[PDB]
Amino acid sequence: AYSLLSSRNRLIPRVEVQCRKREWVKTDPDSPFLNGGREVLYTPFTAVECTVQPMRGKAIRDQNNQLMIGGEEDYDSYTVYSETLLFRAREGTEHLSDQMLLPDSGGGQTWFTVMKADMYPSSGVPRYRYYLIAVPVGTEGG
Amino acid sequence: AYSSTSNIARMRVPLNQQMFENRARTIVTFNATFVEKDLGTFEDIEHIIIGIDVDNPSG
Numbered sequence: 001a002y003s004l005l006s007s008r009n010r011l012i013p014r015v016e017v018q019c020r021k022r023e024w025v026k027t028d029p030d031s032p033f034l035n036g037g038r039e040v041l042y043t044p045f046t047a048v049e050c051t052v053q054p055m056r057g058k059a060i061r062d063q064n065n066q067l068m069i070g071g072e073e074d075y076d077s078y079t080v081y082s083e084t085l086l087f088r089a090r091e092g093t094e095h096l097s098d099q100m101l102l103p104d105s106g107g108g109q110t111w112f113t114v115m116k117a118d119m120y121p122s123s124g125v126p127r128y129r130y131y132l133i134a135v136p137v138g139t140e141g142g
Numbered sequence: 143a144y145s146s147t148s149n150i151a152r153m154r155v156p157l158n159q160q161m162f163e164n165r166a167r168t169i170v171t172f173n174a175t176f177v178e179k180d181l182g183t184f185e186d187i188e189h190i191i192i193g194i195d196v197d198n199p200s201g
Contacts, residue, residue, distance in 0.1 A: 060159075067159050 005125045008083075014049035019086065020111075021045070022096035040096065040140065047084040052102060054078060064105045076104050076134035078112060083126055086114050099141065104134060111135045145171040 008014075021043045026036030055062045055077055065072045086098045099111045112132035119128060135141040148169040154162040 067156055067162075069154075 002123060002125045005127065008049065012051070014051055017047045017050045017052075017080075017082075017100050017102065019045050019047055019084075019098055019100040021098055023094050024096060025094070047082050047086075047100065050080055050082040050084075052078050052080055074106070074134075074137050076110070076112075078102060078132045080130045080132060082128055082130065085126070085128065086117060086130060088114055088117060096142075099135070100132070102132070110137070111141070113141050143173040145173050147171070 023041045025039045025041060026034065027039055028036035031037075062075075062077065064075055066075055067073075080100075086100075087095070089095060089097045097114050099113050101109055102112050104110050112134050114130055115133055116131040117128060118130075148171075150166055150168045153165045153167065155165055157163050
């Protein structure tokens, strides 16, 4: 079985990041809809150690500021290697995708939503790879 | 001569993915008249000969 990869690295620096779980709930008392007035509940936590890297190409959809008919919108993304388990959304449930807070190109800090998670069930070592997309500015995603 | 005009449409076109340029477009229709010259002529009628036959019962 794997031995070296089953232990923490000692050459490349790694950092911890903050995250938060997400659910949703219905608030309207009389509306007949599952949506109602949707609300999201958060529960914070942290990842043991992570590595953050940017997109490699220069494709038009990967550029940071984009020109739309309204104005120069904003976009960011990352690829993350981590030893913590993060989950995407699951259907027929009230759980949403986990989010984690990282620096952006504008100098601030914003939340990124997990979109793709990679796992190797037959190997055993707990090492994962994630792909993240920054939440739209002015909202908390979906 | 001038005849009529079409709708004037205003447009915005991105440039270098940074700026929107103002533009417009229209179609103006004019009348005209074109003249061209033939490549020759036919001959004139200088002499005409006509044959006549008057059918009658006396001969």
